[PDB]
Subunit: 116 residues, 4 copies
């Protein structure tokens, strides 16, 4: 509804998503940073009967037919409607590692998405 | 195969998942704590072609806390890695965000960690 | 040096700090949000021989002579100098809880500080 | 008294601290992993008058990874709570931020969790 569309973040990445009546999120993600190229599949869920913003989250595993970074990012946040819609999030990016390096496997950040 | 199955965290929550050959995660989650009752749908992704150096397999999934019985107006995302072996595990870090007004946006997200096992 | 001074964040809070030659950080914090009133003591450390931004962190326990919220926040980030100095951070706020509620003890966020 | 002492995390790092009556934490930290060698100074704060309902005691501390021997140009902050008893513990979540250029600021901070015990 308000969620379905094309969005961009401060890094220049692109998120295209469709919100299903059943609370599913499906689309593709195109990243401006890291070891990535071309599009990647995304899947997520959202509150389909919100009351405040609308809670949602989605994941991307950084593997496609061209590259594999052996990592995955999860974005957790809320959708805020109005004139200028926005998705405020915090993310976790975890890399596959050996046991010895597991302590440094996860990065944390925050991204804000603007609807086109 | 490795990931596909029924898992449990430290709180006693149950995670039932199927890992597709293609990278998809699909299943149901039942929580032991919080404003929840019954099963909830989950969706996620994982690295279907991990490295061959003994590294873990990266993955992540989301659950929106709404079902036929209740709605907490929130969602959690888990990000981590699957570590195979005799006693397999999924080590994660999670973020739970609630829908809030602007005045409360500063305290909308909780952070934690969960360890899943087959027992 | 560049760090010593008065700073403000997006919430309207105030951070007054002095950076010691030995890498110590000392000052007071005045919060615009939560269960807080008047000033609170802060203590931290910073890289006294940086190369990029300057790594630093500080803590505040939300107890003073007037109120006690039974909680503490830790800010971890980097100092970026220039015309307009800034401290970019991510924080963790943990509340004292019973065993049963420990899973919901910690909040995570991000704050940007501007130097006055 | 409860907090004051020598503690160890899961990685084998050593945390030696003194808790002042007033809310101060002061001590030294020795890391088992990462770009570190020897002891590092730490500083923090804690709730000197916790609640009487069986709740934990909130606390936090920072370490900047620079000493007489090396400098990693980074700092970690731990935030958590002390839980007294026969087998006392300090449960935490931590953030490690490295000094980076603007181009790398997106990947400057790592997140994790540590459990400290007296053994
Ligand atoms: O692009 C973002 O918006 C983005 C935002 C948050 C976290 C990660 C991100 N991207 N992370 C990668 C990682 C490995 C790659 O191979 C490609 C992208
Ligand atoms: O249940 C876990 O395993 C679980 C694990 C990690 C983070 C959160 C959790 N659960 N958080 C809730 C929130 C709202 C509810 O209505 C039910 C559960
Ligand atoms: O004010 C900030 O900048 C601030 C920024 C991040 C996290 C917490 C903050 N403040 N958190 C409190 C908590 C309890 C209180 O009693 C008073 C303030
Ligand atoms: O040592 C721990 O217990 C530890 C625990 C939690 C997070 C980080 C840790 N250590 N991170 C480093 C980083 C740079 C160094 O030079 C040495 C250690």
């Amino acid at each position: 509804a308000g969620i379905t569309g094309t969005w961009y973040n401060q890094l220049g990445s692109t998120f295209i998503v469709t919100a299903g009546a059943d609370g599913a999120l499906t689309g593709t993600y195109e990243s401006a940073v890291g070891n990535a190229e071309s599009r990647y599949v995304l899947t997520g869920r959202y509150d389909s009967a919100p009351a405040s913003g609308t809670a949602l989250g989605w994941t991307v595993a950084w593997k496609n037919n061209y590259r594999n970074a052996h990592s995955a990012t999860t974005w957790s946040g809320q959708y805020v409607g109005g004139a200028e819609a926005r998705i405020n999030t915090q993310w976790l990016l975890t890399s596959g590692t050996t046991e010895a390096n597991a302590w440094k496997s996860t990065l944390v950040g925050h991204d804000t998405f603007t609807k086109v």
